[PDB]
Amino acid sequence: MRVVVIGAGVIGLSTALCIHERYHSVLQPLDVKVYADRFTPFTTTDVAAGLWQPYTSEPSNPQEANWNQQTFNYLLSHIGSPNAANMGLTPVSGYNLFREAVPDPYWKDMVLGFRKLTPRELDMFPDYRYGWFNTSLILEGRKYLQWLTERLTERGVKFFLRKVESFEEVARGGADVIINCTGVWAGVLQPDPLLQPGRGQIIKVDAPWLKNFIITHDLERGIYNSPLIIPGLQAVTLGGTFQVGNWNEINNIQDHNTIWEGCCRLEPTLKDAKIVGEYTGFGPVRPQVRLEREQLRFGSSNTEVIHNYGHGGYGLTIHWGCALEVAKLFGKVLEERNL
Template identity: 40%
Template sequence: MTAKELKKFPQHQFGQAFTTLKCDCPPYLLWLEKRLKENGGQVQARKIEDLWELHSDYDIIVNCSGIGSRKLVGDLEIHPIRGQVLKVHAPWVKHFIRDGDGLTYIYPGIHIVTLGGTRQKDDWNLSPDPSTSKNIFDRCCSLEPSLQRAQDIKVRVGLRPSRSAVRLQKEILFRGNEQLLVVHNYGHSGGGFSTHQGTAREATQLVKEYIGTLEMSRFKAKL
């Protein structure tokens, strides 16, 4: 940042300015769902307690259950990183601002501005904490004082599905003489929208490997 730009942040000695992309997640998810349906995919909503419940309906299961994998497949390595943010109406804010360690940030979207945030390891609490909200608002206002006049402030809480590394691998589960082909793709923490296309391609390749194995087995059975 130039000396002139840094004057806006007197509590900081240096900074960086750059142009990047931001994904507005809710409409993007709707677009992905629409694209899936247009290409023959189906969306079903149901609760399962065990991957074997899907065995009779599908040859291959792709497990993208995030934090749910702790219970669904017994992966105790995955854990929540609690995040609390504020969603505010401040249309005059046009630039992203992120403080040193990334804990304090101001991200304008299409309709709202996101103010953050928290990173609370192993915290499963989904209830908003008023003191945390005040702390977030105060921190963001110190970077952008005009946020004091922001309106329609809403609080959002979520759990980032964190792990030492994304689990992206094949696993064959056995039950008696039966087997269940699984591809795991979860544990992206707060970087899901940054890495999802890449890991999805990797998971697709693993599915194709399974399909090749199934086709070969069926061919041998016919022989």
């Protein structure tokens, strides 16, 4: 059984590990390989702000809420581990800030200690009038990918830096099963008109005094088009743009200004923060995650493709639930093949 995972961001690597950890002991032979044309530090995953938090509105698929919860439970369960920080993980507490009252989010009980903010709390943030406080987890994309690749490599999973031109070519080269974890670029391999780039630009800063996340929301402008500040393990991420349908991979000047001015207003101690980097990435925006089996029919038998893409601005937040479900679907494939 030859499995080729296409993609080496959070989705592909986590899925590869989940599959290997699940079946390595019971299925012989099992060959899992990862193909991708970008590894860390060059994926979208690497640019992510690094916070566990789903969107503020519930998902269309109720499956997705459970996948987020399963991911939170997975990550939280590492917290007393000696390797938590080496995985990119640490607990962080923080603020979600609004101009008016809004309903509690669906994930209020998944996180730790959720509550509304008190009036004394809000005076820290004069431009806002209502909010939440909770504890969540930082999962730093870059570190987590480094961790996942060490885990995979240790287990004998081989990596190939390879641009895939078609599923057909990978099937013809010997894959029995393909896991399609190509993120925003999935449409190249099979058109998908629901998949769009969520263009996000960030400024990375050394401001190690900042210990709490602070996410503001502008109801008139859509999620993450409002100042956000997320402390990472070694730097702070400043954000505030998330524009659907913009394919420009170059940083631009108005977005730099939106982020810097917005964030320096939220947190004016940033006047002394040294700029580390400025970066643009494309979230794989889609009305819902595509996670499903498809049969392909080239040559002299079928190759199964299992899609796992379209996680938008919440790929780190949802990844593990998605990985588990793919491994389950892969199990259904093995059963259909009398393995």
